[PDB]
Structure 1
C-alpha cells in the first residue's frame, strides 16, 4: 500500500518522496539529492528524472534506464534500491524517482587528486572488468566508459554506472570511424584508456576532435594492416585509411616507462585496433596481472536481457504506461 509522501522544494525543483527518505540535500544535476533511508540505515542518492515523458526519446530513455537498472544485480554495477512515483494512478503519472547507494567520488577525483600505485590500479581495473564481464554477458554494451562513470568509495570498491573531460578520449577508434556495428570490446578499449591514465596520471589520447582522436590513436597502435584493411566495409573509410602515411606500432614498454610489465602487456592486449583481436572482459580477468584477485568461482554472469522491448516504435502515452508498470512491479532488494 502506497507510503505517505511529503513535499518540499529544493534547488528550483519540487520533490515528493516517501517519508522513508529524510534529510534530502542536493548534490547537483536530471537532479539528485543525498538522503537518509530511515528504513535500511543507508545514505542514498535520489535521482529525480528530468521531464521523463517530454518526447519519445525521453520516454524511451526513461523506460530503458528503469528496465536496465531493475535487472542489474552485481557488486560492481550500480543497482536499484527503490523506484517510486508520488502518483497514485497512471492518469496522474508524470514523475519518476530512482534510488541508489550514495556515491562519494568518481575515478576522475582519485586520479585528478593523485596518480595511483600499481597495487591500487590492479584492484580498480579488476573490478571494472568483473562488472563488465556481467554487463557483457547480458549482451549489453556500455559504450560510454570513462572515469566519471565509475564510482569508487573509501574502501576502493567500484561500481560501473552511466551518468548520462570528453567522452571521445576513451572511445574505441571504430566509433570515431562511425562504424555501424561494433562489439562488446569497444568497452575494453575504454578500460585500456582508463587503466593507462591511472598508471601515468595523463589522458592517453586527449583528442580535440574525432580526426585528431584517430591521429593520436594511430600514433601509438600504428596504422591498420592489410589484414585489418580487408575488414573495412565502408568504401569511404577504406579510402581514408589507405590514404594515410603508414605509422608503425609503438612498443608500449617504450611508452609506459616505469610501469609494471604485466600492466603493459595487458594494455597491449586491450589497445588493439582490430576489435576481433581485442581481449574480452572474461579473458582479461584471467591475465596474470590480476593473479591476486581473479576467482573463476566469483565472477558471475547475468541473466539474459531483452533489448527489443526498449527499441519498439510506440506512442508517448504507451512508453508512459509501460514505465508505470515497471514502477509498480518493482521488488526491492533484501537488506
Structure 2
C-alpha cells in the first residue's frame, strides 16, 4: 500500500498516492471531477478522476462497476488504457471513493477539424480500435469527434466507456450529442447492432473531409429528414425490421426519396473515400460494412496490416443482466480495484 496525501481540489478532499504530483483541475460535472497530474512513477501526464456518488443508488453502483470492468479490459493502442485505479480505504467496510487514472488527453478530433492522407490515418485508427472493441461484443454507442483523442503526431484513442447515459434533455435540439447517432438508436427503431458505431464513423469521416457536420439536425425529426435525403427513404425490407409500429408508421408518412449520388455530395473527394462512405452510411444496419471489413477496404491500403489489427480477449458481461443490491455491486467494484495490476 502506498502513502496517500490529502489536498482540497474542486471543492472535495482528494486523497491520492504520493506518486501523483501537481494536481490541477481540468474538468467537473455530475460524474465527479478530473485533475491533471504528473505520475512520477511512470513519467506520464495523467488524468485522475474522482468519482462522485459512485454507490448512491443501484443504477449508480452498477454503472461504477460497469465503467471499471470496461476500462480494465481495454488493452489496445487506439483505445483508452486504465493506468491505475485506487481508493484510500483499507477495507471494504470503509470503501467509499474511487479514483481512476488514464493518460491525460489534450486535443480531440474537434480541435483538428485535413488532407486525404490524414483522413485515411485517422479513420484507419478509429476502425482499428472499433475492430478490437467489437470483437469483445463491446459497443461504444456514442462515438463523436469529442471522444476521439489525437496527439501532435495524429495518433488516436477512442475514449468514453461505461459513462452515464445521456439524458433526453441533452439529446434535444441543435446538439452534437445527437448528430453522429445512427437513426435506429436515435429513434429507438429496433435492437441495435455493433454497426451503430460504423454509422458514427461515416458521419465523422464525412466531417473530416468537408469540414462540416454531415447531419446537423435541429431536432430528432429534422435530423432524420437530413439523413433520408442523403441515403434514401427505407424500402419495405428495412420497414419490417423497425419493430415499433409507431416509428414504422411515421417513417411511412414521408415522401419517398432516392439515395443521392455521393460523388456529387462529397465534391473533389477521393473516389475510394466516397465508396467507403456509401458502405458505412447504409440505413439498414444489417447491410452496413463492419470494422473488420472496412480495414480491408482499398481506401486504407497504405495503413492496412492484417497482422497488426488485433482483436480483444473475451469480455464477460453477464453482469449486465444481473440484478444486485447496492452493497453487492460495491463489493464487486472493490474486488476489481484490489485485483488491478498496472500495465508495463
TM range (shorter): over 0.9
2:173 is the alignment partner of 1:175:
no
Q: Contact conserved, 1:176 with 1:211, CA < 8 A, in 2?
A: no
State the SS of the aligned residue for 2:101.
strand
Shift of 1:20: 0.9
Alignment of 1:93-132 (within 5 A): 93-111=95-113, 116-132=114-130
Asked if 1 retains the 8 angstrom alpha-carbon contact of 2:190 and 2:244, the reply is no
- CA 1:330/1:26 → structure 2, altered by over 3 Å: closer, same or farther? same
1:132-166 deviations in Å (ceiling 9; x for gaps): 00000000110000011111111111000117799
Preserved CA contact (<8 Å) 1:149 1:163: no
1:25 Cα deviation after fit: 1.1
Assess if the C-alpha contact under 8 Å between 1:44 and 1:100 holds in 2.
yes
Provide runs of 4+ in structure 1 moved above 3 Å. 163-166
Native 8 Å contact 2:21 2:37 kept in 1: yes
Q: CA deviation at 1:235?
A: 2.1
CA distance in 1, matches of 2:92, 2:260: 59
Q: CA deviation at 1:104?
A: 1.1
> How far did residue 308 of structure 1 move?
1.4
Structure 1, 181-190 or 310-319: larger mean CA deviation = 310-319
Once residues 11 and 238 of structure 1 are traced to their aligned partners in structure 2, the CA distance between those partners, rounded to angstroms, is 48
- Is residue 189–residue 247 contact of structure 2 (8 Å, CA) maintained in 1? no
Q: Secondary structure at the match of 2:110?
A: helix
8 Å contact 1:176–1:213 — kept in the other structure? no
- After TM superposition, the structure 1 stretch with the greater mean CA deviation from structure 2, 180-189 or 164-173, is 164-173
Q: Give aligned pairs, total.
A: 329
Structure 1 position 286, deviation (Å): 0.5
Q: Which moved more, 1:22-31 or 1:157-166?
A: 157-166
Render the CA deviation track for 1:66-90: whole Å, top value 9, x for unaligned: 0111111000000101000011111
Indicate the larger mover: 286-295 or 26-35: 26-35
- Residues 1:164 and 1:136: Cα distance change in structure 2 (over 3 Å): closer
**Does the 8 A contact of 2:148 with 2:157 survive in 1?**
yes
Q: 1:247, CA displacement in angstroms?
A: 1.1
Q: Which moved more, 1:160-169 or 1:186-195?
A: 160-169
The structural deviation recorded for 1:260 is 1.1
Pairing of 1:212-251 with structure 2 (within 5 A):
212-251=222-261
Counterpart contact for 2:63–2:162, Cα < 8 Å:
no
Greater Cα offset, 180-189 or 160-169: 160-169
Give CA-to-partner distance per residue, 1:29-86, whole Å, 9 cap, x none. 2211111111111111111111111111111111000011111100000010100001
Identify if the C-alpha distance between structure 1 residues 314 and 168 changes in structure 2 by more than 3 Å, giving closer, same or farther.
same
Q: How much is the aligned-residue C-alpha RMSD, in angstroms? A: 1.7
Q: Offset at 1:168?
A: 1.1
Aligned-residue offset at 1:238: 2.1
Q: What are the Cα deviations for residues 166-214 of structure 1, in whole angstroms up to 9, with x where unaligned? A: 9210000111221341110000000000000111111000112211111
Mean CA deviation greater in 220-229 or 135-144 = 220-229
Query: Contact 2:126–2:157 at 8 Å: present in 1 too?
Result: yes
Asked whether the 8 Å contact 2:10–2:33 carries over to 1, the reply is no
TM-score, length-scaled by structure 1: 0.95
Distance 1:327 1:67 in 2: 10
Deviation at 1:248, TM superposition (A): 1.2
Per-residue deviation, 1:234 = 2.3
Contact 1:63–1:310 under 8 Å retained in 2: no
Distance 1:84 1:308 in 2: 25
1:245 positional shift? 0.6
Q: 1:164 to 1:27 in 2, by over 3 A?
A: farther
Structure 2 unaligned blocks of 5 or more: 165-176
Which of 191, 196, 200 is 1:186 aligned to? 196
How much has 1:287 moved relative to structure 2?
Answer: 0.6
TM-score w.r.t. the length of structure 2 is 0.93
Give the distance between the partners of 1:109 and 1:74, measured in 2 at CA: 23
Partners of 2:125 and 2:84 lie apart in 1 by: 24
1:106-156 deviation line (CA, Å, top 9, x unaligned):
111111xxxx11111110000000000000000011000001111111111
User: Where does structure 1 lack aligned partners over 5 or more consecutive residues?
Assistant: none
